[PDB]
Amino acid sequence: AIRKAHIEKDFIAFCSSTPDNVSWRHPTMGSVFIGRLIEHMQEYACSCDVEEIFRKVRFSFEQPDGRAQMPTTERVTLTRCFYLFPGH
Amino acid sequence: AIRKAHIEKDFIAFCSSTPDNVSWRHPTMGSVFIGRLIEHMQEYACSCDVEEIFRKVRFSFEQPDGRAQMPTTERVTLTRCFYLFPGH
Amino acid sequence: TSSGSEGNVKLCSLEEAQRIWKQKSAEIYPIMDKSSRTRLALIICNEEFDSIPRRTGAEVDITGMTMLLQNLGYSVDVKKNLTASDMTTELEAFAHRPEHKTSDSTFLVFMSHGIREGICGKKHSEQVPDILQLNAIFNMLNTKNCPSLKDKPKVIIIQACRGDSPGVVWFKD
Amino acid sequence: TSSGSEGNVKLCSLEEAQRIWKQKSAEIYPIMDKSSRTRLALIICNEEFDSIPRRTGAEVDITGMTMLLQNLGYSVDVKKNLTASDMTTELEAFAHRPEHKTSDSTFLVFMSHGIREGICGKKHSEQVPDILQLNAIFNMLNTKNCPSLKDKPKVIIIQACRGDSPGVVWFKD
């Protein structure tokens, strides 16, 4: 027997800035979004689902300096919470 | 004194289906997404933030029938949780 | 009781509210005093079109969303049967409303026929497209074009097709 | 200790894990048995280009993301300096990996120069664009083109510009 499934489901994309806008990369420290993402994943994978972690990353960018950017979550079809359960 | 602010921030969009795909409307019962959204808002505004409510709406669509659709959250720059605190 | 201003929306008790402020500390959008706030919402619904089928049942959607948004504390403007041009004008007018300055948030709801590119205006046809892009909606409500909603959640709800496809694949069960 | 497989990633204790399964009942993605699962991740990073400036510091990003994804339990393929065509080929190959069938999730990470339209391939120039669209990424990993990842979270991370604008507006303080 055959059954129908949604063609697109359980995706989440996380981009380094909003549409039209730049993202920053330090020549020795690396991309600011990437560094910030790693720090938040390390700190929060244990307690927060991925959507919540991405929100926290966005919050960390909130007060703009001379090199501003606002990461954006896009095209989200997660139907459940995605916990990484690090160590398991 | 002047200060910089992000041009695009604190948005969330919620669409009735995924890109390329149809959304359904019953001639007497109304649009399925709209009805489902209202039911979930009524039930969950008191306890869940809007991102979480939208996730629950997506979950309710998960087992497709002859009229399938998967609502999608798009272009999200919410930096905080948006609770409606109904009654307050 | 559903006779109150909140209708069929379940209320958040003071016990629930303080627990919410404990589970998440400084990561919740602030809400303004109920006594002084002026929350606005906008519903644009296209039901009657020049070239494309009438959207039977759209009145059910308008009734449901209008009452829900009122239940949540929003003063709701309902606009019907607009061209993409008219939608743009209405959105710009909405962005300029002085009430947003004494509001903590907004909801915008769009309900129409749609294609991959965006939302159909009343005059839309395949020969002469009349389309409002989601991108234009964001631009009109952003910090440049709507400074009164800086730092405030802006929730955009869109009921529309995004293409012709049924959105499904088969798998062996 | 950071000497373990999880490195600098804080561990979820059994006490934390069971509390998480209490706060949310049947609304968490299932994780497969650690002993038998075969989690995959892909990193595509373009650092050296024909026409556009070298992305100095990209190696720091590759190191950091590779080690993080390994810490989280993923076997990571790293591909460097690809045309949009090569990226498409690599993504299709990734979608066809048999390990996804015995995996519970995936991460895809793209790091490059970018424009509004999408992500730049190594050969990109204004005269002859070499662009991979986000839309193509989703299509290659969906249920039609990647049935092995049906019902499993697919996390796409993109480091790239999305245009030329500084992304800011001024307001009076």
Q: What is the 3-state secondary structure (H, E, C) of C45-62?
A: ECCCCCCCCCCCCHHHHH
Q: Which residues of A touch B4 (CB under 8 A)?
A: 64-65, 68
Q: Which of B12, C163, B37 has its CA nearest to residue A8? A: C163
Please check whether residue A71 is in contact with residue A24, taking contact to mean a CB–CB distance below 8 angstroms. no
Instruction: Provide the 10 A C-beta neighbour count for residue C96.
Output: 11
Angle between helices C134-141 and C84-95 (to 10 degrees): 20
Q: Which of B74, D152, B36, D147 has its CA nearest to residue C162? A: B74
Q: Do A7 and C172 touch (CB under 8 A)?
A: no
Please check whether residue C161 is in contact with residue B23, taking contact to mean a CB–CB distance below 8 angstroms. yes
The set of chains that have 3 or more CB pairs under 8 A with D is: A, B, C
For A82, nearest residue in chain B (alpha carbons)? B55
Which residues, other chains included, contact D57 with Cβ-Cβ below 8 Å and sequence gap of 6+?
A25, A26, A27, A28, A29, A30, A31
Give alpha helix (H) positions in chain A.
32-44, 50-60
Measured CA to CA, the distance from residue C116 to residue C163 in angstroms comes to 5
Q: Is residue C140 within a helix (H) or strand (E), and if so which, with residue range?
A: helix C134-141
Q: Is D113 a catalytic residue?
A: yes
3-class state of residue A22 by DSSP: coil
Residue bearing tokens 């709406």: B57
Which of the residues of C are catalytic? 113, 161
Q: Which residues of D touch A15 (CB under 8 A)?
A: 134, 158, 160, 162
3-class state of residue B58 by DSSP: helix
Q: How was this structure determined?
A: X-ray
Distance of CA C33 to the CA centre of its chain: 23
Instruction: Provide the 10 A C-beta neighbour count for residue D138.
Output: 21
Measured CA to CA, the distance from residue D114 to residue D133 in angstroms comes to 10
Q: Do A78 and B72 touch (CB under 8 A)?
A: no
Residue bearing tokens 């003063």: C75
Q: Do B16 and C160 touch (CB under 8 A)?
A: yes
Q: Is residue C68 within a helix (H) or strand (E), and if so which, with residue range?
A: helix C58-71
Q: Which domains does chain A have, with CATH numbers?
A: 1-88 (3.30.70.1470)
Give the angle A47-A51-A57 at the CA atoms, nearest 5°: 85
Q: Which domains does chain D have, with CATH numbers?
A: 1-173 (3.40.50.1460)
Candidate from C147, C169, C171 with C-beta closest to D171: C147
Residue bearing tokens 């991925």: A50
Measured CA to CA, the distance from residue D43 to residue D68 in angstroms comes to 12
For chains A and B, count residue pairs whose Cβ atoms are closer than 8 Å. 90
DSSP string across chain D:
-TTSTTTTSPP--HHHHHHHHHHSSS-BPPPPPTTT---EEEEEE----SSS---TTHHHHHHHHHHHHHHTT-EEEEEES--HHHHHHHHHHHHT-GGGGG-S-EEEEEES-EETTEEEPTT--SSS--EE-HHHHHHHHSTTT-GGGTTS-EEEEEES--SSB--EEEEE-
Candidate from B12, B20, B46 with C-beta closest to C165: B20
Candidate from A26, A33, A68 with C-beta closest to D168: A68
Residue D90 is which amino acid?
A: E
Q: Do A41 and D167 touch (CB under 8 A)?
A: no
For chains A and D, count residue pairs whose Cβ atoms are closer than 8 Å. 195
Q: Which residues of C touch A6 (CB under 8 A)?
A: 167-169
Measured CA to CA, the distance from residue C14 to residue C173 in angstroms comes to 48
Which residues, other chains included, contact C14 with Cβ-Cβ below 8 Å and sequence gap of 6+?
none
Resolution (A): 1.8
3-class state of residue C137 by DSSP: helix
3-class state of residue A34 by DSSP: helix
Q: Which residues of C touch D147 (CB under 8 A)?
A: 169, 171
Strand partners, B74: B13
